[PDB]
Amino acid sequence: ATSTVTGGYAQSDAQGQMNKMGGFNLKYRYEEDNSPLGVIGSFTYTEKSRTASSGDYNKNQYYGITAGPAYRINDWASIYGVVGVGYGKFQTTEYPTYKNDTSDYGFSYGAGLQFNPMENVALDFSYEQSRIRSVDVGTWIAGVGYRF
């Protein structure tokens, strides 16, 4: 078997891709004892706030669980479709309105991409998109790290 040890930074941004909201990442899955079959785990954690001069004071955190396998077509690369849900319950934490009416989910989906590994280097990507009504969310995650 193998364990592809990856992690890195992510930007979950919504309503207009402009927001550094990430924290850390770790991806860690097991590989099969016959086929070249792996599994691919996204985990996101958002713990950034964004001042400038307006008052975007990012309350709450997101939590986002997306999953799928990874398998080769013949023997070039291993990529697959991955699917999940994203839950965040934010609030405007400046203007005299506080939490308005927040609470919804979005079914995150996209593809999970995994690169040709090394003996101490891995390169893993997820790109997940969700919608809430008429606000898109996009989240990319870098999985850089090792493999053994």
From Swiss-Prot:
What Gene3D superfamilies does the entry give? 2.40.160.20
**SUPFAM superfamilies per the UniProt record, alphabetical:** OMPA-like
Q: Name one Pfam family in it.
A: OMP_b-brl
Q: Mind listing the UniProt keywords for this protein, alphabetically?
A: Cell outer membrane, Membrane, Signal, Transmembrane, Transmembrane beta strand
The record gives the membrane topology as: Multi-pass membrane protein
The main place the protein resides is: membrane
**Localization, UniProt:** Cell outer membrane
Q: Which residues lie on this side of the membrane: Periplasmic?
A: 1-2, 32-36, 73-76, 117-120, 148
| Top-rank lineage group of the source organism | Bacteria
Where does the sequence pass through the membrane? 3-12, 22-31, 37-46, 63-72, 77-86, 107-116, 121-130, 138-147
Extracellular-side segments: 13-21, 47-62, 87-106, 131-137
Q: Which residues form a coiled coil?
A: none
Quote the InterPro entries the UniProt record gives.
Bact_OM_Invasion-Related, Enterovir_OMP, OMP/PagP_b-brl, OMP_b-brl
Q: Which GO terms describe its cellular component?
A: cell outer membrane; host outer membrane
Q: Which family does it belong to?
A: Belongs to the outer membrane OOP (TC 1.B.6) superfamily. OmpX family.
The record's PANTHER family line, in alphabetical order, gives: OUTER MEMBRANE PROTEIN PAGN-RELATED, OUTER MEMBRANE PROTEIN X
Identification of the protein by name: Outer membrane protein X
Q: Which organism is it from?
A: Escherichia coli O157:H7
Q: Write the lineage as a comma-separated list.
A: Bacteria, Pseudomonadati, Pseudomonadota, Gammaproteobacteria, Enterobacterales
